[PDB]
Amino acid sequence: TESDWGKRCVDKFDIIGIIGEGTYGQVYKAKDKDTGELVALKKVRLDNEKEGFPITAIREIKILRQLIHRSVVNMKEIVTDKQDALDFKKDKGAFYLVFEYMDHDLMGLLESGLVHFSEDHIKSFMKQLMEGLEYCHKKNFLHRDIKCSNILLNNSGQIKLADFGLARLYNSEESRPYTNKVITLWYRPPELLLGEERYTPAIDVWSCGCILGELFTKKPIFQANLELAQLELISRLCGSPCPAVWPDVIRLPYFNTMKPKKQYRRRLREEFSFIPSAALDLLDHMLTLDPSKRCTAEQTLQSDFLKDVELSKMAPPDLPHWQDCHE
Amino acid sequence: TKPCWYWDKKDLAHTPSQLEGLDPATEARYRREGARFIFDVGTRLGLHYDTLATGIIYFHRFYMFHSFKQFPRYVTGACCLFLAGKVEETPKKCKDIIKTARSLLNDVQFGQFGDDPKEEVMVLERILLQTIKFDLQVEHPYQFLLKYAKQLKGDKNKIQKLVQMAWTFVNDSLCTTLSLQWEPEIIAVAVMYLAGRLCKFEIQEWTSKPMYRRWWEQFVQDVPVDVLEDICHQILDLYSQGKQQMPH
Amino acid sequence: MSYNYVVTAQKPTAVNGCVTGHFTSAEDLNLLIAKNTRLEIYVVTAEGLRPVKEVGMYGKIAVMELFRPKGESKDLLFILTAKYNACILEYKQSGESIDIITRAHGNVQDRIGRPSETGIIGIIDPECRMIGLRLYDGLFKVIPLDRDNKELKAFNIRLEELHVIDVKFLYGCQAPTICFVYQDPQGRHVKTYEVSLREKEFNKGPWKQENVEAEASMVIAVPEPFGGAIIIGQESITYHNGDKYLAIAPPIIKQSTIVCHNRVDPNGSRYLLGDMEGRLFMLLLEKEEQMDGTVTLKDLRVELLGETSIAECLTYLDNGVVFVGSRLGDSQLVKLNVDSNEQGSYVVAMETFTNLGPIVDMCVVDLERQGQGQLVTCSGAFKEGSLRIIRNGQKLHIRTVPLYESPRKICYQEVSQCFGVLSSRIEVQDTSGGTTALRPSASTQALSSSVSSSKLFSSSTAPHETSFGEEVEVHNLLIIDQHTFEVLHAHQFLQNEYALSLVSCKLGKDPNTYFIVGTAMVYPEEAEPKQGRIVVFQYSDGKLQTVAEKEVKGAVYSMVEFNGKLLASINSTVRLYEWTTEKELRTECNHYNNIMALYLKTKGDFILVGDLMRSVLLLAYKPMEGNFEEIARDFNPNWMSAVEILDDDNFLGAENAFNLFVCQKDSAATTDEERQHLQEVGLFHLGEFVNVFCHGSLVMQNLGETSTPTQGSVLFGTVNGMIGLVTSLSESWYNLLLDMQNRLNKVIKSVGKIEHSFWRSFHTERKTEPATGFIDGDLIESFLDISRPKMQEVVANLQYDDGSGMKREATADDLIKVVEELTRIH
Ligand SMILES: CC(C)n1cnc2c(NCc3nc4cc(Cl)c(Cl)cc4[nH]3)nc(N3CCOCC3)nc21
Structure with missing residues (x-):
């Protein structure tokens, strides 16, 4: 049946080429021999066998077989290399996690300079992203690695969230010790720069607010190399962490350690004054310092900016593929 | 989409182990020993109760597809716990599981692990994953025992006694094939039902529908008493066969 | 790691801007010409220009303006680079010693901002109170010109109009005032604001907004006799002064877009306008005086003067002399006469300054057989299109072969003692239903000619409608003699067929040398071409013969000869074709893992692929198997303009951002994942846009000189005319x-x-x-x-x-x- 995963062979796919270096293996583009569908194959190498099957891949299998959403990447099956006949101990063959092939990733499109987003294009994008994040959050999962490179976009305007290799369940009743450094420095929230270790789903909201800002400038908002420099940049824009705006900042391991140059005032509305009012309000609420005052995913979907955006009118972003050859 | 992980009691007469000459009593004994091995090993390592149960469920499912005569049970158990730890985010290093398994197993028993215990275990992960069809998410009677008990209102102490007694029945049911016969939601109700009889409690009075005598129906739809009593019979058989008695 | 060296062989020649003033002395008339990264300072004489000084800057010159603040004897120079480096400069001469003083400097980049579509705009107040910069959408940056602001510190005023087309500081205002055209959903508008340094904000401007032409492009600040603005469009020119509206819409300007303006008479009575077909106009402001003592603008008139080069910048010097700064053709000095010549023109060329123009393609060939290389380039656009032959001899000798249409690709065919050149010319839909060319050109002045009669897309059934006056490109293959540079033949491709790629080679066991062209069927409706051809031609006895055609399902962006086989990139696909004994192309292998296979290079059985957005990939032909295999891909995303193979391990690429990089095989063979990774070991900002990499050198090899520290030779051509060289x-x-x-x-x-x-x-x-x-x-x-x-x-x-x-x-x-x-x- 369709549900008996791990047995079908990767022979069933014509490999088209390598599309990325992954975490637990290389990622390949391929075509299904039987249906003609294009897939993305994430290879799992257990040949190292330091700790066996990688937990990163286990997270993606465990979570993505539970999550069903139009904006969450879909795992279709798991297939294997030709297994050694009657010799399971020698068998070192790999497993491949089968995904739908998405035409692009947001970083590559932004890094190549080949995208332009109108306000209505940003509405269509963010409504999908937040709806997908809300689906995950209602199910009590944290993505913990929201960056532009983990948002896949195909040319119809459809957005899908992608790398769940750091996703873990969130319990509100039971506070759980989590890993301190989860999101890429550029999209990391201030609460984790101070080492929260018990963070809320609001970490993902911060990242998406950073993306929201980036889509209006085409340049990331907080670009730093070191955790202190990052806190400085966030502070120059959002204001310095202080009990006046984040009463519990004093409980954080590094609050006294990682002081910014000044106690800055918030200028987010000034430095982003070229943004539409409905959107600027969303950015200000998503880039709130105190995670308990930072809006939820749902609250973004019930905002003037995204509330009345209709998904039937997807407006695909302006990806030009002609006049690129000759300017 | 998703696989079927439940069988009929009658179907356990045709497990691979049985058709290779193992008798019903022996396979169940092996199942108890393997499950309890998983439970004891993980408890020594400080593992969460869900992590122990997930490994035990992997174990029970495994031996619906393989024979104990070809897969030594303690190796399988150790492997299931090892994978369960990664699945449930309570990971342990394989060497530490082996260390604990050696502490608890005699010389004959640890012979199953062969000359290289860690290798025999790590090698099996491939088979374990293909066997469980990569359906790694598992639900257990515990979460339902608590979800349903939270909706009971009354004497704090009588309900807590009900929960603890039922919780023990859940731990004891992991040694059996009930995990393969009934969904966890049904197991949680059955153990509440059993504790109620043993505690001489009438649970309906704690529900929002106190004159609904079949109190469980508002938790688990479509469950006959036939089922809950079969489950109770199977749990108490465990106590009668052994020397141990009901907790009360 | 990799080690490489990059030198300029020819400096940028295209003129990016030109201003006049009194920069070197309060007495002299200066002409400052800006080429990319280069500033040229001249002094205006009665015969032409006297050069006085040239400096380079570590930046692309984006803004260049002269101003004279109260207290200075002579003009100061403001420059802003494209990396947002600002400075104020002064000329100082001590006898024979000439130097350039940096009076103020700083970088004005904002941490947060959106780069505007119409680019950086820089303007200066008529009272030289401040510098205005439009760097980002929704913001106006002010550098106040006080004596103390040696660091050029500035502040931003929120601007409600996010999409600004153009802005100027107006003349005749009680406070510093800006006039700007902006675009919002309701069309385009002209609006005015006052700028208050004291309040650091905008206040309401002198006059009311008016709705303007949908394609309103340029703002002219008319000087004090008539103070106001002139708004130039595609169809109309409009003057606004507050209560005044004047609109002239002469049919002559609708034909070609006007792109530059400059003031002739300092009173504003006469302005110069230039267009993209080389036409030079005079915009005349007719004045009526009132006994009130006040002058008013009575009417506007436009008069055609003649032809210049398609010019980016115009500047009137003195007497009748005008400097024409072109980016697409040669720059010029031209004299405007009061009397027309017998052809009706008032413009007569004086001098012509070489511009290698856009170098769309080029090749190195030894025409003289002197063991030294000659570079034949595809240079220029439209009527300024040309072939240029560059040789070394201390200056570079450059011959110009005018083509009067756009050259696209060039390749040399020795067997035929001639070059093949792809070209395109602009025709316009005319009343016959067909099209008519605006000027005769290389593809129409060939000795012998032919037209494709292919029936491949003949079935069509795709409706494409034509409106009178619309432009079309007509593409041709030109056969051009290597000694005379005479157009011996011209082959016209199908209607709506673009010629994209050209090779000259032998294939298989076939002893004939062919010209092979890869094309794309380009329809306005299509996001990406879905039809195309690979055509095999033979140039024999003055006639081009069509040998074979292969239909493809996309654009043949790139082709290259590969060990007797034809390597072609069709959209995402990279394909290897074999040449059969029946003289037809037959596919052997395909590789599909691309976004758009824009560029191809080969060495041995290895292929370097340049992608639209996925940087560079290294493929290999595995002959034992008859297929391609992937060796390594640069996973950093970059938009490629051209690529080249340096050696078996190092690969060179150029970005659309004016940046260069070198990738190398990781050569740490422990893991396959390392081997499939191309590491960018070289990163460099050239500041030029490289269209073509080409192995070779113009230097002489008599062996008197020694084995230089450098090994290898890659020449590269750019949009601004720069020719550079990369070596290891x-x-x-x-x-x-x-x-x-x-x-x-x-x-x-x-x-x-x-x-x-x-x-x-x-x-x-x-x-x-x-x-x-x-x-x-x-x-x-x-x-x-x-x-x-x-x-x-x-x-x-x-x-x-x-x-x-x-x-x-x-x-x-x-x-x-x-x-x-x-x-x-x-
Ligand atoms: C496996 C799932 C999540 N998935 C499903 N479709 C995709 C997907 N498609 C976008 C894409 N099309 C490419 C083609 C070429 Cl030629 C190249 Cl070079 C790059 C490419 N990227 N990308 C990624 N990621 C891209 C960034 O690095 C990691 C993988 N994942 C995917």
Whole structure:
């Protein structure tokens, strides 16, 4: 049946080429021999066998077989290399996690300079992203690695969230010790720069607010190399962490350690004054310092900016593929 | 989409182990020993109760597809716990599981692990994953025992006694094939039902529908008493066969 | 790691801007001409221009303006680079010693902002109270010109109009005032604001908004006799002064877009307008005086003067002389006469300044058989299109072969003693239903001619409608003699067929040498072409014969000969075709893992692929199997403009951001994942847009000179006319020349006090990295121009390595020998 995963062979796919270096293996583009569908194959190498099957891949299998959403990447099956006949101990063959092939990733499109987003294009994008994040959050999962490179976009305007290799369940009743450094420095929230270790789903909201800002400038908002420099940049824009705006900042391991140059005032509305009012309000609420005052995913979907955006009118972003050859 | 992980009691007469000459009593004994091995090993390592149960469920499912005569049970158990730890985010290093398994197993028993215990275990992960069809998410009677008990209102102490007694029945049911016969939601109700009889409690009075005598129906739809009593019979058989008695 | 050296062989020639004023002395009339990264200063005479000074800047010149604040004797110069480096400059001369003073400087980049569509705009107040900058959508940056602002500190005023087309400071206003055209959903509008330095905000401007033409493009600040603005469009010219509206819509200007303007009479009575077909107009402001004592604008008139080169910037000098600064053709001095000549023209050319224009393609061939290379380029656009033949002999000798249409690709065919050139010319839909060319050109002035009669797409059934006056491109293959540069033949391709790629080669066991062209069927409706051809031609006995055609399902962006087989890139696919004994192309293998296979290069059985957005991939032909295999891909995303293979391991690429990089195989063969990874080991900001990489050199090889430190030779051509050269170094030679750069940067004084390390930094809107693996040869070659004190200051405590002697001290004359050898690579 369709549900008996791990047995079908990767022979069933014509490999088209390598599309990325992954975490637990290389990622390949391929075509299904039987249906003609294009897939993305994430290879799992257990040949190292330091700790066996990688937990990163286990997270993606465990979570993505539970999550069903139009904006969450879909795992279709798991297939294997030709297994050694009657010799399971020698068998070192790999497993491949089968995904739908998405035409692009947001970083590559932004890094190549080949995208332009109108306000209505940003509405269509963010409504999908937040709806997908809300689906995950209602199910009590944290993505913990929201960056532009983990948002896949195909040319119809459809957005899908992608790398769940750091996703873990969130319990509100039971506070759980989590890993301190989860999101890429550029999209990391201030609460984790101070080492929260018990963070809320609001970490993902911060990242998406950073993306929201980036889509209006085409340049990331907080670009730093070191955790202190990052806190400085966030502070120059959002204001310095202080009990006046984040009463519990004093409980954080590094609050006294990682002081910014000044106690800055918030200028987010000034430095982003070229943004539409409905959107600027969303950015200000998503880039709130105190995670308990930072809006939820749902609250973004019930905002003037995204509330009345209709998904039937997807407006695909302006990806030009002609006049690129000759300017 | 998703696989079927439940069988009929009658179907356990045709497990691979049985058709290779193992008798019903022996396979169940092996199942108890393997499950309890998983439970004891993980408890020594400080593992969460869900992590122990997930490994035990992997174990029970495994031996619906393989024979104990070809897969030594303690190796399988150790492997299931090892994978369960990664699945449930309570990971342990394989060497530490082996260390604990050696502490608890005699010389004959640890012979199953062969000359290289860690290798025999790590090698099996491939088979374990293909066997469980990569359906790694598992639900257990515990979460339902608590979800349903939270909706009971009354004497704090009588309900807590009900929960603890039922919780023990859940731990004891992991040694059996009930995990393969009934969904966890049904197991949680059955153990509440059993504790109620043993505690001489009438649970309906704690529900929002106190004159609904079949109190469980508002938790688990479509469950006959036939089922809950079969489950109770199977749990108490465990106590009668052994020397141990009901907790009360 | 990899070590490479980059030098300029020809400096940028396209004119990016031109201003006039009194910069060198309060007395002289100056002409400042800006080429990319280069500033040329002239003095206006009665015969032409006297050059006086040329400087380079460590940046692309984006804004250039002259102004004279109260208290200065002479004009000061403001320049802003494209990396947002600002400075104020002064000319100072001490007898024979000429130098450029940096009076104020700083970088005005904002941490947060959206780069505007119409680019950086810089303007200066008529009272020289402030500099206005439009860098980002929704913001207006003000640098106040106070004596103390030596760092050019500035502030931003929120601007409600996000999409600004153009802005100027107006004349005749009680306060500093801006007039700007902006676009919102309701169309375009003209609006005015006042700028208050005291309040650091906008106040309501002098006059009311008016709705303007949908394609309103330029704002002219009309000076004091008639104060106001003139708004230039596609169809109309409109004057606004507050209560005044005047609109002339003469049919002559609708034909071609006007792109430049300049003031002739300082009273504003006459302005010059130029258009994209080379036409030069006079915009005349008719004045009526009132007994009130006040002058008013009565009417506007437009009069055609003649033809110039398609000009980016115009500047009127004096008497009848105008400087025409072109970016697509040669720049000029032209004289405007009061009397027309017998053809009706008032314009007569005086001098012509060579512009290698856009270099769309080029090849190196030895026409003279002198063991030295000649570079034949595809240069220019439209009526300014040309072939240019460049040879070394101390200056470069350049011959111009006018084509009067756009050249696209060039390839040399020795067997036929001629070149093949792809070209395109503009025709316009005319009343016959067909089209009519605006001018005769190479494809129409060929000795013999032919037209494709292919029936491949003949079935069509795709409806495409035509409106009178619309433009179309007509593409041709030109056969051009290598000695006369006579157009011997011209082959016209199908209607709506673009010629994209061209090769000359033999295939298989076929002894004939062919011209092969790859095309694309381009319809306005399509996002990406879905039909195309590979055509095999034979040039024989003055006639081009069609040998075979292969239909493809896309655009044949690139082709290259591959060991007797034809390697073609069709959209995402990279394909290898074999040439059968029946003289037809037959596919052998395909590789599909691309986004758009824009560029192809080969070496042996290895293929370097340039992708639209996925940087560069290294493929290999596995002959034992008859298929392609992937060797390594650069996973960093970049938009490629051209690529080239340096050696079996190092690969060169050019970005649309004016940046260069080098990728190398990881050569750590432990894991397959390492081997499939191309590491960007070289990063460098050239500041030019490279269209074509080409192996070869123009230098002579009589062997009098020695084996230079440099090995290899790649020439590259750019949009601004620059010809550059990339070559490799040994680890030892790099470290020396690199250590020497850091020493030179401390010694050499930069114009605008721009850090060299900043200029050559890799720069995209999203990234900035320090340069690596590249020696700025133009910096090294400047050691020979610095004074002796500075030379000895550079060589202090300098030690060689990996040499005959492991540690060797350098003397000034030691370096002069090395640098002078390095100057001989071009
Ligand atoms: C596996 C799932 C999550 N998935 C499903 N479709 C995709 C997907 N498609 C976008 C894409 N099309 C490419 C083609 C070429 Cl030629 C190249 Cl070079 C790059 C490419 N990227 N990308 C990624 N990621 C891209 C960034 O690195 C990691 C993988 N994941 C995917």
